[PDB]
């Protein structure tokens, strides 16, 4: 989840 | 989290192919796709489930819903010949579909 | 780009280090598999679920190392590369064949 993950991916 | 592709696909030159790659709720993910030629490195033909790359032609077109996302290949040349993987994310892990060999004869 | 290790035995794959890195092993008759990611501008490292732990994420080049190599580890190799945020991939290194035995 948070930040982190949106450097890898941005959920549609 | 699971994602499956039909094994084959097996189509003359020029007829359009269609490769689905189902998991739960896919419909809600941003799903990308892979050309593996073979013994290449795969080239992304889609991302965004339908969006695509400069240098891939506009016969190549996607979908996404429910359950399942599609690509679409017109037009089918030899060259197409390959392994397709589709791709998604969820929960901070990457998973690929199983693949599907697509035969140009 | 093909190389011979011996069981029990460990490869390094490196990859060079705005961008996201990710290590993806292709099997004989098993498509592709991810290994991990890992993102230079911000140093975090993704493992992948279902090698036993036997993967190690470094950077000084990035380095996927497999420990503890087995016949099942047979496969080609990649590093790939894609955009910051975008979950895609849109270049694909040459793969490397390990050959376990």
Known sequence: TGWLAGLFYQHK | ?105 | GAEVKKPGSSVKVSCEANYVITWVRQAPGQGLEWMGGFIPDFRTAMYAQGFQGRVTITADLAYMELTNLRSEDTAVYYCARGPLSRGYYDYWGPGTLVTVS
């Open chain 2, 1 to 105: 989290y699971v994602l499956t592709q039909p094994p084959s696909v097996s189509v003359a030159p020029g007829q359009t192919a269609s490769i689905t790659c189902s998991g739960d709720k896919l419909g809600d993910k941003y799903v990308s796709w892979y050309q593996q030629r073979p013994g290449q490195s795969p080239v992304l033909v889609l991302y965004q489930d339908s969006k695509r790359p400069s240098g891939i032609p506009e016969r190549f077109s996607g979908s996404n819903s429910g359950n399942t996302a599609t690509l679409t290949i017109s037009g089918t040349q030899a060259m197409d010949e390959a392994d397709y993987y589709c791709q998604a994310w969820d929960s901070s892990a990457l998973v690929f579909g199983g693949g599907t060999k697509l035969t140009v004869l």
